[PDB]
Amino acid sequence: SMLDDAKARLRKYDIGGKYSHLPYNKYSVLLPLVAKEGKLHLLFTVRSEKLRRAPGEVCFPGGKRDPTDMDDAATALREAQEEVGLRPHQVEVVCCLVPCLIDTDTLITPFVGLIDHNFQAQPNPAEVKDVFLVPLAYFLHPQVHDQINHIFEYTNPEDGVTYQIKGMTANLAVLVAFIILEKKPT
Numbered sequence: 001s002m003l004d005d006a007k008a009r010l011r012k013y014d015i016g017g018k019y020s021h022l023p024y025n026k027y028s029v030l031l032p033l034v035a036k037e038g039k040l041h042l043l044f045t046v047r048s049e050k051l052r053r054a055p056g057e058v059c060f061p062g063g064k065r066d067p068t069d070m071d072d073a074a075t076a077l078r079e080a081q082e083e084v085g086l087r088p089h090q091v092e093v094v095c096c097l098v099p100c101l102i103d104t105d106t107l108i109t110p111f112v113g114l115i116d117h118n119f120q121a122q123p124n125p126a127e128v129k130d131v132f133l134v135p136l137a138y139f140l141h142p143q144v145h146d147q148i149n150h151i152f153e154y155t156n157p158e159d160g161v162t163y164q165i166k167g168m169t170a171n172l173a174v175l176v177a178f179i180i181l182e183k184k185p186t
């Protein structure tokens with residue numbers, strides 16, 4: 001099936017806990033995969049203006065590890081619940097992708113999760129201004145604008161609203177699309 005095929009592809013790129021003990025400032029993100037109308041989509045947030053990190057930017061749900069978290073996957077799930085109301089029984093964490101090194105002292109660990117079909121986002125307005133889906137296939141033929149810095153523009157055909165996706169967020173979206181969608185019969 002579509003969902004079983006995605007999980008089998010994803011598992012081949014799982015690095016697991018290999019880099020998780022290194023002595024960095026630690027953050028985790030959840031890359032949430034949602035199936036709608038027979039296709040896979042990724043879920044994104046727009047951060048609220050009043051945050052420290054990335055005010056007003058398009059990002060995946062996530063945040064800083066705290067002492068309560070059993071592991072890096074726990075960080076991602078805790079933060080996703082706080083930001084958009086995703087509960088743990090509504091997510092299957094499938095793998096841990098290559099981590100992102102930034103600022104010389106920080107490591108960001110990305111996890112891919114499959115999201116239950118009955119989940120409906122409840123945006124927490126203290127953290128998130130908006131929550132939206134993009135079809136995964138978009139990232140194979142994106143609409144690119146150069147600011148050189150490459151920026152993707154996505155317009156939701158439901159409402160005509162345009163979103164700008166860039167940086168590590170855009171890079172991770174492309175990676176997930178390549179993993180799941182490359183070399184597929186039609």
Ligand SMILES: Cc1ccc(CNC[C@H](C)O)s1
Pocket residue numbers: 027028029053054058059060061062063064108168169172
């Ligand atoms: C927890 C976070 C660390 C940095 C962030 C900014 N958005 C980038 C993310 C890869 O979508 S959020």
